[PDB]
Amino acid sequence: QLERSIGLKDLAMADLEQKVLEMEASTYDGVFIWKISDFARKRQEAVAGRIPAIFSPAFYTSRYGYKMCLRIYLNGDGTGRGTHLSLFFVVMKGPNDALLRWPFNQKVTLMLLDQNNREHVIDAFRPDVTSSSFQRPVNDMNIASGCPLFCPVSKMEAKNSYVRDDAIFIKAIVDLTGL
Amino acid sequence: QLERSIGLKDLAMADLEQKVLEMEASTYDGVFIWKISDFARKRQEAVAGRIPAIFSPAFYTSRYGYKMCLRIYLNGDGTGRGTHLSLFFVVMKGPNDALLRWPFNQKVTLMLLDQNNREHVIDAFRPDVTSSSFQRPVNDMNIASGCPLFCPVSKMEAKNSYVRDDAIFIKAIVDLTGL
Amino acid sequence: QLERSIGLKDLAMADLEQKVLEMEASTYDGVFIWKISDFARKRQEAVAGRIPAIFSPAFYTSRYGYKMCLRIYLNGDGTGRGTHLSLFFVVMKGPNDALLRWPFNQKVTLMLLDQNNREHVIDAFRPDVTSSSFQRPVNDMNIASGCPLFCPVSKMEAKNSYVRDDAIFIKAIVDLTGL
Amino acid sequence: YPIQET
Amino acid sequence: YPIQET
Amino acid sequence: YPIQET
């Protein structure tokens, strides 16, 4: 029984440490910057098919607003499978969802930052209020929605300004108009 | 012997989980929304007299301002014992108390939110500067002060819009005028 | 294996407990208030030469801006050794450094607060953009830079308004002009 | 006027 | 117009 | 200008 408690406390720690990790990243003004380090390795795991996508830490539109996160496929998804970097927006089940207006209807802007401040890969969209991706969450996360053809897998190949020090920066901006 | 040391850690980690939980809730603009889940059970524990009151997580007027929290009695307190929901405001001992002006003299507004955004139970008050509830804290928490007859226990009984999904939302707004 | 397993976990905890201690102190508007408790002992450990300096928790100019902290020598450093309280500013290695402009070029104002809101010890400075203290961090922390002769060790002697309840407050203000 | 808890 | 993940 | 720590 004593040996058990050991293996148990070890995981309970990973969760708390993960919860602290999320905490350090959450923002509450609708502007989020996601840093993905160890890019090469993660990019490989995606091409290899071992880990197709990664979720970013959660962020909010306001202190008690919508809870959201991003989901990225380093080797593309659907119509961008294998050819592009696919970036999606995710509406998460929030603590105060009962106090918010549904469906989610805020404009979202996704960006792959040029670490030379040059040409930033940018794309935006307005939610389709009839889509399940923007209705009030029933599960932890709604179906991700966004850009399957966000960025050609070549625009971030060998010598480019998006990947630097084996890390990339994704930025999201959620318009707060009407909230 | 080794069984003792293991519990030691498990306890310490429980505390850390509590602290992180606290931070996840603190705000610094004087506006606070408290979500009380598992309401029916908590309501019961109060009627049964086993747990008369609950303290909310702490919140602040500014990053280095007053530290405050709320205290609720799901089955009333004092003149409202057994007939009303009693809601109070609490001035807590803050780290920066030495830098703040005393006694606390900010207007406070307490609310029980209608989850149908219709009729919110609202009440407000201005501190009685001679009350010990607003003197600079000597202990962790000053004597709570507020509304003993905030809301009739019938307003949130059975079929109503305040209790939904077995949870209610309390909101506090601390006027920042003069700070 | 027991002394080994239980041993490692204690370190990871110290870290997590540290990360969490940092987070609750960090601000993101360039204004920081550092509370130093147990002053008498800390002051002594500096005079005795066991602990010459202390680093404050980190703070930022914006959510994804520069990471900074302060370093104090309760018994002076360099030209202020033994005669003054020396206070320095520190540019730390930030998560988003690659996205920021270098060298660091923001005006910094340091203050030792009078707990009687009377006369605050104040000094400010503009970075020397060619100094190593302000180039992009290569290690965790760049060399601290600031005020070796911030405050005479006598000002905060016996009967004064800076030390109260065995604690002092240091405040830093980082001008955000241009960011 | 605030009323203190009992 | 957002496209859902598959 | 700021003076570096020693």
Provide CB contacts within 8 A for A82, sequence distance 6+: A75, A76, A153
Token pair belonging to B106: 């900010």
Cβ partners under 8 Å of residue A49, min gap 6: none
Q: What does the alpha-carbon distance between residue C53 and residue C87 come to, in Å, rounded to a whole number?
A: 9
| Three-class secondary structure of residue C17 per DSSP | helix
Report the alpha-carbon distance of residue C154 to residue C48 in Å, rounded: 17
Neighbouring C-alpha atoms within 13 Å toward the C-beta of B95? 15
Question: Cβ(A87)–Cβ(E2) under 8 Å?
Answer: no
- A and B adjacent (3 or more CB pairs under 8 angstroms): yes
One-letter amino acid of C172: A
Nearest to C77 among F1, F2, F5 (CB): F5
Q: SS3 of F2, please?
A: coil
The verdict on whether omega for the bond into residue C103 sits within 30 degrees of 0, i.e. cis, is yes
Residue B17 phi, psi (nearest 5): -60, -30
CA–CA distance, B79 with A121 (Å, rounded to integer):
63
Our count of domains for chain B comes to: 1
Separation of alpha carbons C37 and C39, rounded Å: 5
> Which of B173, B133, B122, B60 lies closest to D2 in space, CA to CA?
B133
- Give B18's contacts in chain A (Cβ within 8 Å): none
- The Cα A26–Cα A56 span in angstroms is 10
Residue of C nearest to A25 (CA): C63
Q: What are phi and psi of B109, to 5 degrees?
A: -125, 125
Which token pair is B135? Answer: 């003197």
Kindly state the tokens that stand for A119: 């040409």
Cβ-Cβ contacts under 8 Å between A and C: the total is 36
d(CA B153, CA B166): 15
Q: Sheet harboring A31-37: ordered strands across?
A: A31-37, A167-174, A108-112, A121-125
Q: For residues B74 and B159, what is the distance between their CA atoms, to the nearest angstrom?
A: 17
SS3 B9: helix
Per the CB < 8 A criterion, the answer to whether A62 and B31 are in contact is no
Q: How many CA atoms lie within 13 A of C116 on its CB side?
A: 9
Distance CA A80, CA A26 (A): 29
By the 8 A CB rule, do B163 and B156 touch? Answer: yes
- Report the candidate in C99, C98, C75 with the shortest Cα–Cα distance to residue C87: C75
Using the 8-state DSSP alphabet, how is residue C6 labeled?
A: H
Give the separation between CA C3 and CA C39, rounded to whole angstroms: 36
How far apart, in whole angstroms, are the C-alpha atoms of residue C101 and residue A116?
11
Residue of F nearest to C71 (CA): F5
A143, A72 Cβ separation under 8 angstroms? no
Beta bridge partners of residue B71, listed in sequence order: B55, B88
Which DSSP helix (H) or strand (E) runs through B69? strand B67-73
Please give the Cα distance from F2 to C108 (Å, whole number): 10
Alpha helices in chain C (DSSP H): 2-23, 39-47
B81-120 CB burial, b ≥16 within 10 A, e <16: eeebbbbbbbbbebebbbbbeebbebebbbbbbbbeeeee
Distance of CA A115 to the CA centre of its chain: 19
Closest CA to A171 of A80, A35, A43: A35
Residues 62-101 of chain B whose Cβ lies under 8 A from any Cβ of chain D: 71, 73, 77-79, 86, 88-89
Supply the CATH number for residue B43's domain.
2.60.210.10
DSSP label at residue A101:
-
Give C78-122 as a 3 state SS string. HHHCCCEEEEEEEEECCCCHHHCCCCCCCCEEEEECCCCCCCCEE
State the number of CA atoms in the 13 A half-sphere of B179 facing the CB.
22
- According to DSSP, residue C170 is labeled E
Full domain range(s) for residue A89: 1-179
What are the distances in angstroms from CA A151 to CA A40, A121, A157, B93, B167? 16, 7, 11, 52, 43
Query: CB distance from C129 to chain A under 8 Å?
Result: no
Q: Which residue in A6, A12, A95 is closest to B13 by CB distance?
A: A12
Are E1 and A125 within 8 A, CB to CB? yes
Chain-centre distance for alpha carbon A167: 15
Chains touching chain E through at least 3 C-beta pairs below 8 angstroms are A
Q: Give the H/E segment covering residue A47.
A: helix A39-47
Tell me if residue B8 falls in helix, strand or coil.
Answer: helix
Count of A-E CB contacts under 8 Å: 41
What gap in Å lies between CA B46 and CA B52, rounded to an integer?
Answer: 4
Q: List the structure tokens of B131.
A: 């009350």
Contact indicator for C92, C58 with CB cutoff of 8 Å: yes
